[PDB]
Amino acid sequence: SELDQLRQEAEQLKNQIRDARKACADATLSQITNNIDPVGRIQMRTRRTLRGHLAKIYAMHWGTDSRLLVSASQDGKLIIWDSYTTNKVHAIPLRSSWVMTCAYAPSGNYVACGGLDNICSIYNLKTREGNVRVSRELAGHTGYLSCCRFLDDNQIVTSSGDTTCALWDIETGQQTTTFTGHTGDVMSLSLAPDTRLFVSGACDASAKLWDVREGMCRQTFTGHESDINAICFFPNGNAFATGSDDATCRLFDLRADQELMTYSHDNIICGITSVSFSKSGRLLLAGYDDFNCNVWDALKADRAGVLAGHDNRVSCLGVTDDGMAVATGSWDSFLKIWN
Amino acid sequence: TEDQRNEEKAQREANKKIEKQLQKDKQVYRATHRLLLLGATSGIFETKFQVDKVNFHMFDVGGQRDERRKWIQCFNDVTAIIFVVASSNQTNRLQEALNLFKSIWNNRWLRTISVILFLNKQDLLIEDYFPEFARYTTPEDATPEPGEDPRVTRAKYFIRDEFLRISTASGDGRHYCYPHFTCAVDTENIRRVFNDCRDIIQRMHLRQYELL
């Protein structure tokens, strides 16, 4: 059949790509950094505790002033907190109970949320009246919304469970570019500092690099076993990290197009829900299903600290822009701030 | 200066007002029963009804895909799951339904939820697909319908026990199964749902006090 020859040509191309990557592999990251010394001992304690929500919590996001943050819960509420003084500011009731993601605008004038209704809703905070009401609704996805990240006040990028990603125009309300490369559901995404490229992880155990302007995939990163749950991007601009259900984190390099590190331990069996980096890119923090977080070391791959003290599953994780605080959420209704 | 105290007072007043609203919201939220409806906005559906001044709120998932290993974890804190089965060439849908039931029963985040089972289209209603419908006998305690068809009754009580085996093979102590035959048509299903919900709630408290 004509399908067989095309398949064998694809296999030959895959073999050529694998050989090209194998040729460039001169040394490992461990050997180069074997000379440096360990970070030491890192211990953190809970400085603040927030007790507003009723049901479990799925998402949170930090503000660019590193003082306000929004959180989403499955009872149908959005709450904006003040991190310095534990008092709330806004409480926003949602039309649909199951919200699965939330984002905070860089300017501080908008927030977003989405869930099983397949719709993304934009909320206006600063208004003449003084209340909060929906501005726009973005329909068109054929699957539940799972992540959204503001690019500016007029643009946003979303991922859903119909194996596609889209770029929206808020005032127009119509899709502009669609990225159809994945096979399974898309779980998370992360934007670059210059907001020119971004990466996503799906349930096909693969990650991709997208071009916002052109609109087609440039690189595909493989080598993983199971579904990818979280993804974060490195401060420099040439690396990113992933987390998944096989209890393993990995480090990838855009300019080298290869995997560089693996963060796994023998007694760790549960999955990974969220990952994040530190300000200098030296500490890699992650959340697990065993109710506590871990602090890794990106250059040497050894465990330095542990963030315990949660009564249920940890779902979200975040680090401030100035890097002076860390906030975590969990399936119990409490938020903790660590420093 | 004095403006700082004014800002703090305003912030505390706003906090007090929103806490006062959340108190009423909490009182309203925890007196409602949430049910999930399975089978075999466009994304999600809603439905409200009341029996004996009790609030129910059922959810139908008809806008999603057929890969449900990810969005099914959002229903781990519901009261019960309603599972509709068509008891009637075919493609052996009974085995597919049984496998889905087994997966739901054995899932980690749904390993404590009860299931209410509804067999439908008894009027329309085994020997080729299942080679054990020949050494089976009708259970001693049975209430046959006035139809009195021996083959139909035998098929009914062979299908019910097939689902009961999965439920009794594991998950012993903290969840159960309530099978019903949909002989009643018009409005007798909601009364049954009410009864099972009441039983589940009573058993939950008794288990919490360790009297069962």
Partner: nanobody
Framework: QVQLQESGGGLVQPGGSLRLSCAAS????????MNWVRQAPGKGLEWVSD????????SYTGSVKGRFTISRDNAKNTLYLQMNSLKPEDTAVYYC?????????????????????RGQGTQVTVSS
């Protein structure tokens, strides 16, 4: 990358015997549970059988119960299916698949072709 490749499909008259196998790579074989899946012409996907991590637990679909058997080799990362006394009804395309999560007793893999962790299959036909 996860990859599966089946082999051993061939035409056979009624009463014959066939042997099927698929070899896995790119993941730890011992940590996952395997299945067998068929697709009849003009009909949807149908689950056939499954085997536990250590091979202790075995299940069958009822139509083929008592005629098929399944075994796995952890050392060589290979799955086997033994077929005896075939009939013209058995003609279909056979797939071997695994469920996505390790250390789990529940799997969701009888879905459409969209399932990523599946092979390509070999044609098996019975006629005269």
């Amino acid at each position: 990358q996860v990859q599966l490749q089946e082999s051993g499909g061939g035409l056979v008259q009624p009463g014959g015997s066939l042997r099927l196998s698929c070899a896995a790579s790119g993941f730890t074989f011992s940590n996952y549970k395997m299945n067998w899946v068929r697709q009849a012409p003009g009909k949807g996907l149908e689950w056939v059988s499954d085997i536990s991590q250590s091979g202790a637990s075995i299940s069958y679909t009822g139509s083929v119960k008592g005629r098929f058997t399944i075994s796995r080799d952890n050392a060589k990362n290979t799955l086997y299916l033994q077929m005896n006394s075939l009939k013209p009804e058995d003609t279909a395309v056979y797939y071997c698949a695994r469920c996505p999560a390790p250390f789990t007793r529940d799997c969701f893999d009888v879905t459409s072709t969209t399932y990523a962790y599946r092979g390509q299959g070999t044609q098996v036909t019975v006629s005269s």
